[model samples]
Target chain A: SVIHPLQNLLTSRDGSLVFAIIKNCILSFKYQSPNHWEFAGKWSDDFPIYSYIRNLRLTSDESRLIACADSDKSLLVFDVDKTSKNVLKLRKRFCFSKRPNAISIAEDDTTVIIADKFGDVYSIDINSIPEEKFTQEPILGHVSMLTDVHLIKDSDGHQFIITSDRDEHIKISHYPQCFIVDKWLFGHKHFVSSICCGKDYLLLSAGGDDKIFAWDWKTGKNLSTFDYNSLIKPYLNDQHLAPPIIEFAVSKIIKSKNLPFVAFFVEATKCIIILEMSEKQKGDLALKQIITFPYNVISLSAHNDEFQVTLDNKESSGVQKNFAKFIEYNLNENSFVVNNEKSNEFDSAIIQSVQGDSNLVTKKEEIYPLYNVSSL
Target chain B: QLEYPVSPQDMDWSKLYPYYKNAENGQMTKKVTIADIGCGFGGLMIDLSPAFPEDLILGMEIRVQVTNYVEDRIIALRNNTASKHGFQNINVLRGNAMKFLPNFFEKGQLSKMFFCFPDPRIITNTLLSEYAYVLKEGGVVYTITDVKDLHEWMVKHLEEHPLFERLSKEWEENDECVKIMRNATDKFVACFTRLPTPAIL
Candidate 1:
């Protein structure tokens, strides 16, 4: 009854649209029509020769895409406009030591933040005409490797870098000054994988222990903790370990503009759950399982207007394989076609016919002949 | 200066029970005070108060609503005992014992601190920083819960803390609850052999 490995769920800026980023493809859904979704597209037709695709970042204005291609040991930047049209043009690429583990973008859309396997974070500014790379060396001792990073803007327009490392430390660094503000959060016994800033007041983080935490950002104090195992206990498959790794494990948090929802992956359950917040209560929240797919999701990223999810297919052979995928979810149905396989093609007539009033349906339900008929 | 909410002047005890009736015959003696931490409801306090009328008993709760309920229960008991010898030793206070324990009590202020079913996550390393500042030395902290993992976690941390002493084998063997807790939950129960008597600087 539920989809497996619901890796990433995202809603567009207008809040009327939704997207589920799965193992190898992205599916689109509109809130007006809940029962159906269209397979928007896949990132790469050929598998990337890697076990995981570590991270993904959509640009702030939804104009660009930045992703950590683990097998390739490179950071991939794509023009969002061209990628959606299936052109898939690579804007720029940067290589690093080992694989890139996480990627983030600043609110200005000009700066890109990347964390690599070597425990270092590189800040690259894209606004420069020729595109230059600026690297900030790891602040922690040599034993620490950075796992995640978030750019936090204070009330006075000051920005800080909040980074978690393999050493079980969460360090905050103020921009310009680049001084270490605070260190040694020291809670989890294992590696911290994901961290997302929530409205300046809260920080949501997940770790190897299958637990998610809500923290008071200012004090670095844990406010509440929820066990991922308990939350997804009912939905797990018969074999305890059968849950797909990428889908259920949360790699990112995306707040939606259209609906009262926040989307994130849950690894143990192998699905993405949309947490719906009540309008009346500031933090009253509930969960709804939104997307189920067939791959493990290692990383997720989104912009305010649109979003992108990157996933790697589960390894069938003993050795690691290479297959990376990218799916974009648009808020408006501007370029979204219900079920047309050739929708990505530049047929203006066909595109216009399906543009204004297409009813959304699931990819499975939309496979029938009647549903597949061109609206044109 | 801590103040009791109501005057201890007009409590009566003659109409009460076999204990009161026997007290008139001079059979039992009472000389103790107990503190209940995180007391959700005052049922335990109410049941023990009448049995130990001569002993001072206080229940502390963090929630205002629950504390008010306990206060009302004490008031009802006082009104019922207006005519007999006084039962004037029960009281309740509203405050977060986790954050304010030392503020209200000095070292060794409490003989026993009963903490039943406290939040398990609150005691983890994430909150351990706060625990180091609040827990008192030599003050026995008692806890009971059905959660097996939580029981073991509590025992592990308390045993490793510098201020606590593991109870001796003789004391642990004599305590049936400790034996039962270890048996039913399979959690390692740590006993304090000696309270590290602080050095006078």
Candidate 2:
């Protein structure tokens, strides 16, 4: 079967290089003077890439290494050497089960944690990767699907894994002893797809439904749920009813100039809702502002006082949405401005998923059936 | 793995059962009264539809291939019957009965809910304690498992649940649904596999 058609571009160990997937193969180029792209060696592709992307993690000890994995089940370790003729030489490839959904590596670069589409998560060793031959079973699993997972290490060196699934489940479990599910954060009525935690075990989770939830892992108590529907209530000009099905593209916590808290950027429904979280903050997230565009976002990159975004034109008339574009967000003033000088020419494509009648037919995600086919 | 509409008010059941199309607003006119979770192959639906002809039965199976197979079986049965709604009173929809049943049916909307040989370890304990909002006050919700350890676990969860209690042996013996369930696969299982020259009833 063909793989899902997924597209993404990620930064390498050093900022000077850029690598992107072009049909299951990893392609690399220089950040500037991008006329030529040095072939970084294909990673092999049996499935057509679509719904998933390669998780490229840049971690460092004394030197930096780029860890990347695709649906081919190979974890590629890229050597970042300037002296080498090929900038990104494939060092070692470790294979695992299922298509890789997300990858998070330890600081020392010894332990690697990977979450897969089958909702099965496994722990892998840096030196020993046996793949299917590996005797280890999944540390955690969800019948529906896992969207993202994080391996959190506190100051005391205790590791915990916080994972979100297609169902409204945010599980916080102990690492190494991951089978022990310590706490489950549940409040959102939709699929809990992303998790971003600040200091003091205060976490922010967004279920594709219309809310972002804030929870405390210490007591496993949900502090509050932020409704994006009400946040966009003033801008509602159409007859569209119910909540919008906004797949959270990506989100992260970033500190700004002289601020006690970090800026939380969560992308959904062609918009990024920016919330400012401060130290000792509880219950509610401070709403900074949101950036709403007419097209689906392709990528998001963050800088100190600003963030940049790339968008794909929504597909129409079976034509592929291929127009490349960029936009910048000013953090100080919390506002979005179009990059008028550099953006490619295009019209805003509005692709609104119809609601109401569709949600009525809604069911299934997490619970399985046990019918007696033989008896009947 | 799948994208779902967030609310039940958005779904059009008539799309799944077109013969029950409302004459006025062109919406689903028939309502589902009974549900079978993890309804494998829908053998129970085939037998019960004729027994309870006036009532609507819905089966929820999460597995994609299993759900698709049951849908095809229902279609084939309907083509052969070709009555008022062609056995349209019973249909199957893809669902995970436990996670968010509130999204599919309104509170106090269902009269009966069944679990046939469900994996007792995974969901039964939690489901047994939490199926009240969907079922009416006097409605019947039952679970059937052949294993002793698993059956004990199911009964333990049910006994501990506040909204439910053990029913009398007499009720179990006299219940029409349970009667259909016992030796449920008579000739329909055989009839379905080799009912070649099918007509009507």
Best TM-score goes to which candidate? 2
lDDT of 1 by residue, B1-201 (tens): 222211111122222222333555643233224566666676556655665556555678877888888777777877788555444566677865543343344234445554456556434332222233233345455556667877777767656544455566677678743543344312334543214434322
Candidate 2 reaches a DockQ of: 0.03
> What class would a CAPRI assessor give candidate 1's docking?
incorrect
What is the per-residue lDDT of model 2 for residues B113-197, given as tens digits with 9 covering 90 to 100?
7776766444443343235556766777666666666666666656655556667666677677776766554211000000111
Compared with the true structure, all predictions reach lDDT values of 0.48, 0.56
User: TM-score, each model?
Assistant: 0.43, 0.52
- Expressed as tens digits, the lDDT of each residue in A1-376 for candidate 2 is 1111113455543434555443344444443322223333233343423322366566644234444455446666666554444555665666666766777775457767878777777777665644555456676666657778888866678778887777766766667655344555656566665566666777777644566677788677778766666664554433223354222323433333333333333342355556666455575667766667655444454433444444433333343333333345555655656554333221111011111222211232211111101110
Model-by-model DockQ, in order: 0.01, 0.03
